[PDB]
Amino acid sequence: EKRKAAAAILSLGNVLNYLDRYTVAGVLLDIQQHFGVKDRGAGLLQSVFICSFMVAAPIFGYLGDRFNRKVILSCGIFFWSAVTFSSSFIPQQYFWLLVLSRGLVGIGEASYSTIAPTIIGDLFTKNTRTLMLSVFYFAIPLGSGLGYITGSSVKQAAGDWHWALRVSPVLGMITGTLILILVPATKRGSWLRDMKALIRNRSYVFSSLATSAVSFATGALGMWIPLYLHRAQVVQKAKDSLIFGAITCFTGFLGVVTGAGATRWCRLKTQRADPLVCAVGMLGSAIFICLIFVAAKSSIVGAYICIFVGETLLFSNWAITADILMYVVIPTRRATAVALQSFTSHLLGDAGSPYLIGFISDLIRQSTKDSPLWEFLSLGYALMLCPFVVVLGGMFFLATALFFVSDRARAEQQVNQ
């Protein structure tokens, strides 16, 4: 009751946590025409969000261990909710204010993302704990798709795009209030040596690189596909991001389910089933992601079908990389491994993926005739680097597969002693 409600309100907070990152991505067209910026600043928004998130996350993992986790969590939520509401009133000439507010929202969300799973893990035990944490993660695809749908529908209804940013913090105030009320005051229960031991961990290194490629593809695509689809529709002379949000929710759930089923099918034949599957999914999704840019030139329904299948296949290896890190890393180094892997996946992945895609798009457009057709074509050419990164991530998962047996053998050897 007390702890099941706490888990419920923390799951709602995570829904809001992910609903506030993709509200900007679902209204990006209106932001560009309002502020007059090109693809570069549009990518810079999400890049600054992720660059602040990945730097604040370790610090809040260090502050939550020392001080009250629930106080930091509640102050974080309220803080990003306020930054989101206050930034909705930014006038036209201050785009740097909007980018800096995106960065501040990323700092606050880092507190929640870092501290809420520890609270849920400390409230529950065993299977109860495993299910509860799962419900918390269930909010990633639901939150993302709801962010897309919310931004698009609120811009459609209100006649303005700021209301996309204005409607969500009202729920964050209530979630922070109930986290003050519902969530109990739960208490707490060398890194460089662990890093020295983990750099020689070939399977951990290559799994981290594969996760970095996944993050690159996910960040760039989730930022730039709702806008690429709109440009495709305009050249093929709102709805796009609503359909994309529905697809995002359903494909996140379906991808987790299908990855679990595939690994459960492959446990009968290969000891390297966990990484190998992760590779075959990636080289699968890379076939379909590229097809997004082949179908959208002629049909948007084909683009949606390819998004569906490629997003199901890209999201299948989300829960299997955690399996690999559990398998190959001894539990004393597992916290450092998770922290460093998150930092590496952000830094080499989605911290610069949206800005890189925007910069490539702008550089293609500058050396070429300017037109809606060429806007759409330049964004497609820029986005064609996501399939290449997915191919490299599949190669890195294969390299993890070659060493999975050896590294898991040494991990079991060390934990048995």
Ligand X SMILES: CCCCCCCCCCCCC/C=C/[C@@H](O)[C@@H](N)COP(=O)(O)O
CA distance linking residue 59 with residue 155, whole number of Å: 35
CA distance linking residue 187 with residue 262, whole number of Å: 39
Contacting ligand X within 285-304 (CB under 6 A): 289
Q: Residue of minimal CB distance from ligand X?
A: 222
Element (H, E) at 134: helix 126-137
Number of residues that bind ligand X (CB under 6 A): 21
Q: Which residues sit directly before a break in the chain (C to N > 2.5 Å)?
A: 189, 237
With binding defined as CB under 6 A, does residue 259 bind ligand X? no
With binding defined as CB under 6 A, does residue 307 bind ligand X? yes
Q: Classify burial at 209, counting beta carbons within 10 Å of its beta carbon; exposed 0-12, middle 13-18, buried 19 or more.
A: buried
| DSSP symbol at 160 | S
| Given 87, 218, 321, 342, the residue binding ligand X (CB under 6 A) | 218
| Given 248, 312, 336, 378, the residue binding ligand X (CB under 6 A) | 248
CA distance linking residue 77 with residue 108, whole number of Å: 6
Residue identified by tokens 């079991």 is 412
Nearer to ligand X, 71 or 319 (CB): 319
DSSP state string for 343-357: HHHIIIIITTHHHHH
Nearer to ligand X, 229 or 399 (CB): 229
Taking the complex as a whole, how short is the minimal distance between the CB of residue 93 and ligand X, in angstroms? 31
Which residues neighbour 351 within 8 Å (Cβ) at sequence distance 6 or greater?
47, 50, 51, 54, 219
CA distance linking residue 231 with residue 73, whole number of Å: 39
With binding defined as CB under 6 A, does residue 227 bind ligand X? no
With binding defined as CB under 6 A, does residue 116 bind ligand X? no
With binding defined as CB under 6 A, does residue 130 bind ligand X? no
Nearer to ligand X, 310 or 380 (CB): 310
With binding defined as CB under 6 A, does residue 349 bind ligand X? no
**Helix ranges (DSSP H) in 182-272:** 191-199, 202-235, 239-266
The residue type at 304: Y
With binding defined as CB under 6 A, does residue 252 bind ligand X? yes
Nearer to ligand X, 205 or 289 (CB): 289
**How many CB atoms within 10 Å of residue 250?**
16
| Candidates 33-41, 136-144, 169-177, 179-187; binding stretch for ligand X (CB under 6 A) | 136-144
Contacting ligand X within 44-103 (CB under 6 A): none
x/- letters, 142..181, toward ligand X (CB under 6 A): --x-------------------------------------
Q: How far is CA 353 from CA 43, 67, 163, 212, in A?
A: 8, 34, 27, 11
Element (H, E) at 284: helix 273-295
Nearer to ligand X, 31 or 307 (CB): 307
| Candidates 134-142, 197-205, 267-275, 368-376; binding stretch for ligand X (CB under 6 A) | 134-142
With binding defined as CB under 6 A, does residue 220 bind ligand X? no
The residues binding ligand X (CB under 6 A) are 134, 137-138, 140-141, 144, 218, 221-222, 225, 248, 252-253, 256, 289, 307, 310-311, 314-315, 318
